[PDB]
Design a protein around this ligand. Sequence first.
Ligand SMILES: [Cl-]
Ligand SMILES: [Cl-]
Ligand SMILES: [Cl-]
Ligand SMILES: [Cl-]
Ligand SMILES: [Cl-]
Ligand SMILES: [Cl-]
Ligand SMILES: [Cl-]
Ligand SMILES: [Cl-]
Ligand SMILES: [Cl-]
Ligand SMILES: [Cl-]
Ligand SMILES: [Cl-]
Ligand SMILES: [Cl-]
Ligand SMILES: [Cl-]
Ligand SMILES: [Cl-]
Ligand SMILES: [Cl-]
Ligand SMILES: [Cl-]
Ligand SMILES: [Cl-]
Ligand SMILES: [Cl-]
Ligand SMILES: [Fe+3]
Ligand SMILES: [Fe+3]
Ligand SMILES: [Fe+3]
Ligand SMILES: [Fe+3]
Ligand SMILES: [Fe+3]
Ligand SMILES: [Fe+3]
Ligand SMILES: [Fe+3]
Ligand SMILES: [Fe+3]
Ligand SMILES: [Fe+3]
Ligand SMILES: [Fe+3]
Ligand SMILES: [Fe+3]
Ligand SMILES: [Fe+3]
Ligand SMILES: [Fe+3]
Ligand SMILES: [Fe+3]
Ligand SMILES: [Fe+3]
Ligand SMILES: [Fe+3]
Ligand SMILES: [Fe+3]
Ligand SMILES: [Fe+3]
Ligand SMILES: [Fe+3]
Ligand SMILES: [Fe+3]
Lengths: 168, 168, 168, 168, 168, 168
Amino acid sequence: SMVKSQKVIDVLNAHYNLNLELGSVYAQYAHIADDQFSMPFLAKFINDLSNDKLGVHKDLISEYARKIEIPLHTKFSVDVSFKPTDPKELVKHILETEQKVRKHVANMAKVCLEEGDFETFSFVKWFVDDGIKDFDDVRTIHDFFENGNNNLQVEYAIRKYLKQMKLE
Amino acid sequence: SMVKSQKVIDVLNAHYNLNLELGSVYAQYAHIADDQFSMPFLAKFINDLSNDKLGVHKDLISEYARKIEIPLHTKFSVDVSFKPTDPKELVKHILETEQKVRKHVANMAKVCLEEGDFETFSFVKWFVDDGIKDFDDVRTIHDFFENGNNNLQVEYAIRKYLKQMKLE
Amino acid sequence: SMVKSQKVIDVLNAHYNLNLELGSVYAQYAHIADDQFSMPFLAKFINDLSNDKLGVHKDLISEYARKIEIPLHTKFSVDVSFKPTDPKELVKHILETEQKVRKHVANMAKVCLEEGDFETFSFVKWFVDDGIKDFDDVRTIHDFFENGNNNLQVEYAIRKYLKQMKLE
Amino acid sequence: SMVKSQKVIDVLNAHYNLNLELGSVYAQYAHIADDQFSMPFLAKFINDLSNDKLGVHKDLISEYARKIEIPLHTKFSVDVSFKPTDPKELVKHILETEQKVRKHVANMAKVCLEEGDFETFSFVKWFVDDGIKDFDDVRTIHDFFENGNNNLQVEYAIRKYLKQMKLE
Amino acid sequence: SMVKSQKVIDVLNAHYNLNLELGSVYAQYAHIADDQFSMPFLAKFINDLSNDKLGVHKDLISEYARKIEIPLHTKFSVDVSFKPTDPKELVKHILETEQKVRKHVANMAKVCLEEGDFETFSFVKWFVDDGIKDFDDVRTIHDFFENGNNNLQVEYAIRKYLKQMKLE
Amino acid sequence: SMVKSQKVIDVLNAHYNLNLELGSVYAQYAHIADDQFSMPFLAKFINDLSNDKLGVHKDLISEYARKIEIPLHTKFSVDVSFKPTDPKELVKHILETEQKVRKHVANMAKVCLEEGDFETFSFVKWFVDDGIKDFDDVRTIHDFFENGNNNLQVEYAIRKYLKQMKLE
Ligand SMILES: [Cl-]
Ligand SMILES: [Cl-]
Ligand SMILES: [Cl-]
Ligand SMILES: [Cl-]
Ligand SMILES: [Cl-]
Ligand SMILES: [Cl-]
Ligand SMILES: [Cl-]
Ligand SMILES: [Cl-]
Ligand SMILES: [Cl-]
Ligand SMILES: [Cl-]
Ligand SMILES: [Cl-]
Ligand SMILES: [Cl-]
Ligand SMILES: [Cl-]
Ligand SMILES: [Cl-]
Ligand SMILES: [Cl-]
Ligand SMILES: [Cl-]
Ligand SMILES: [Cl-]
Ligand SMILES: [Cl-]
Ligand SMILES: [Fe+3]
Ligand SMILES: [Fe+3]
Ligand SMILES: [Fe+3]
Ligand SMILES: [Fe+3]
Ligand SMILES: [Fe+3]
Ligand SMILES: [Fe+3]
Ligand SMILES: [Fe+3]
Ligand SMILES: [Fe+3]
Ligand SMILES: [Fe+3]
Ligand SMILES: [Fe+3]
Ligand SMILES: [Fe+3]
Ligand SMILES: [Fe+3]
Ligand SMILES: [Fe+3]
Ligand SMILES: [Fe+3]
Ligand SMILES: [Fe+3]
Ligand SMILES: [Fe+3]
Ligand SMILES: [Fe+3]
Ligand SMILES: [Fe+3]
Ligand SMILES: [Fe+3]
Ligand SMILES: [Fe+3]
């Protein structure tokens, strides 16, 4: 009677796999930030985003899938081809990816409401709120570049932003 | 003059991608352990293995690749199709996968010595030692099944093993 | 029966003297950094490199030479003639010198393996690992210059890097 | 595929048994030091060497043998016939025995490399490094005799050396 | 006038060598427990028995031999051929060996009284009391097998017994 | 107007290079003390003297040279050929070298006064006072040999002297 609809099963499966995929993609972006641009604090910020998708984000979804007793299957592929010309272009690309994440998460909420799945509608709220927060954090990093003159100044701003994020 | 050989670049790239791939695969195995077999402590053990491949293992390799200034590229695919009939079969499959990891790591050391790359030969020692340790941990879990009569007894043994591992 | 080969004796003697020589050379480079460029935090970084070659590096080698009972003799000369035009050129010159150190250390490992001297092969691992770490630290300082616009910004980045190194 | 070669199995078995054998032999040497020469601090030093061979050394090998799943069998015999005329001759005999241990350990490393057994090659490094350290400790005790005039002076030097060893 | 009889000298020499011999034998039994039966807590219990024979037991005897100024000589051989079919058979074999130890120790006390050697009669009391205690500990482990249904249950009981022994 | 005379520039340059030279020479003497004479506490004393010349002594001079804005250049050579027959001869040779250091430092003070360079005259006072203190410490070690009968007794006296020096 609490048997979940296939539409809900599909959006949860898609979003589980998206976090594994994007977590792996973002790990390569963090590598690029340090390897190509010599910006290790930008790399730390991107690696924190990667770690959240590869860890908490996917862990929460599979945990919840088990509670509501739906099938979950892992299938995705990664082939990171993006070649940014400069670090701001890398951050803008990540920003545009987080905008897609916000869209995916909104569609999850929409489908849950359509199906009257209030359990999953409530579960998805965490991703709605985290979607806008991650997007806003990335856009702050992006706007450092447009407020500065060189990568060392941006690195300084990122290092302090990271400390501030850890102080909740 | 410290320009690394393509053979070394290739084995490091392969092993970086293998850890991302296997980390994602093992996360689905941990899900199966809890979802299908209702063995959450077995799932915790497998999830710890997953977290190490998705975290420390790949992080160490990309970090080292940047120091020696080699190209690193992310490309892999995951499609978890394994359907174990019982939890011991799942653990045995993981054991056989860790045996392949030991082989891959041995081949890395072999190729480094062939190329006279003592920097990378020394780096790889961490994976040699961790390869045998992970394999041995998995085989201990496997031998719990052959020493017990039901999954609850095994769960008890795993929970205590995990505490013991955390006490280094 | 554990009488060491002349080839091993020679590479250890050469590397002992190289650290005394380079330690003295780097002390003059640190002086130049402060005296000519008014970059005292760059000078601190270079002086730390000097202190390690003049201290730990040479101390470890002579200590080990005594254990394996080989002759050790001190003979080297220093005449620091390098006149950098700017501080990045100074750091690049140090980077190229650390690249030579990596080559010398690799040759030590190669000769130990050729002679079946596993005692010294294991001893040399410390210098292999320290070679790549020192090189990477210097290259980080170098890349500060290419990420910044003036020496004060670089000084800021070096001061923070030094704090980070002291926090292991 | 990680099935270990008989040559590696043999050197590990030999070295396990050698540590049990030498540990028992050295316990009798420690007895001689106190019983015949009335040098209880020399006896403490020798008993510490005995305890390490009978304890940590053999424990590490059997532990590792189980991980790599090789056969291990115990067979050795002890018949301590050495009759030193004075305590320096006893210490020199131990020194010559530790020189044989260094040779045995080097042969283990050599055989591991020949077989491409990097797991065991890495395991053996602990014994390479401990071989030279034990040898050097014994030779320090030996050189006390050639720096002193009577056994009480040597006993004083040994007691302080032991304190120093315990302060790592 | 306190010159000890040859009969007492012989039983002390025999018991010194027996502890070295049995300590080495029991170390192989502990290996079997873990290697063949995958019972690491049974192995810990047996290794503790081994450590006591190789350590305290033999150390006490040689210490005492020196005080009473008797000759002590080390000669024994070990060739562990026992192949238990299951872990209870291994523990029963150890139990029967500790029964022989109790007999040997009783004979030591008997011979001391015959010779009027009250010094050694009092010394031997420690081994009389430890003989029955070790025997009783082993028999408790043995009776775990006959109270349980599988090795995991026994392992649980042994782990708790070991904690209890450490709480004196 | 505070432009320093060439005579002062020369004595400071000479004394900077002398400390690098002697620091390197004394490091080889410390090696000889341990390697040839098996006197590790004598080696510690000599190594402390070496460390002071290679560290504080040269660091103070280059620091001061930068403040008064004089040229400083590094050029020296080391070829340690001294072959002492016994450890007292080694210590006497060091004593005679510290006597030369006292002469060099006195000449520095003399030249500063001649030139009316009170800044450098005051700076040099630290080396005047340290010159006599180092000389006196070395002569105390030397007089241990003439108060003792063997190297172990001297080693004892040096170890206690070193503790006393560390208690200021
Ligand atoms: Cl850039
Ligand atoms: Cl852009
Ligand atoms: Cl820039
Ligand atoms: Cl099941
Ligand atoms: Cl199976
Ligand atoms: Cl079950
Ligand atoms: Cl400049
Ligand atoms: Cl440049
Ligand atoms: Cl500038
Ligand atoms: Cl004597
Ligand atoms: Cl001798
Ligand atoms: Cl004497
Ligand atoms: Cl069984
Ligand atoms: Cl039985
Ligand atoms: Cl069972
Ligand atoms: Cl001498
Ligand atoms: Cl003299
Ligand atoms: Cl002497
Ligand atoms: Fe659940
Ligand atoms: Fe997030
Ligand atoms: Fe977040
Ligand atoms: Fe890097
Ligand atoms: Fe290591
Ligand atoms: Fe791992
Ligand atoms: Fe691990
Ligand atoms: Fe030494
Ligand atoms: Fe270093
Ligand atoms: Fe370093
Ligand atoms: Fe094991
Ligand atoms: Fe040892
Ligand atoms: Fe040791
Ligand atoms: Fe005694
Ligand atoms: Fe009593
Ligand atoms: Fe006992
Ligand atoms: Fe006991
Ligand atoms: Fe200055
Ligand atoms: Fe001084
Ligand atoms: Fe001083």
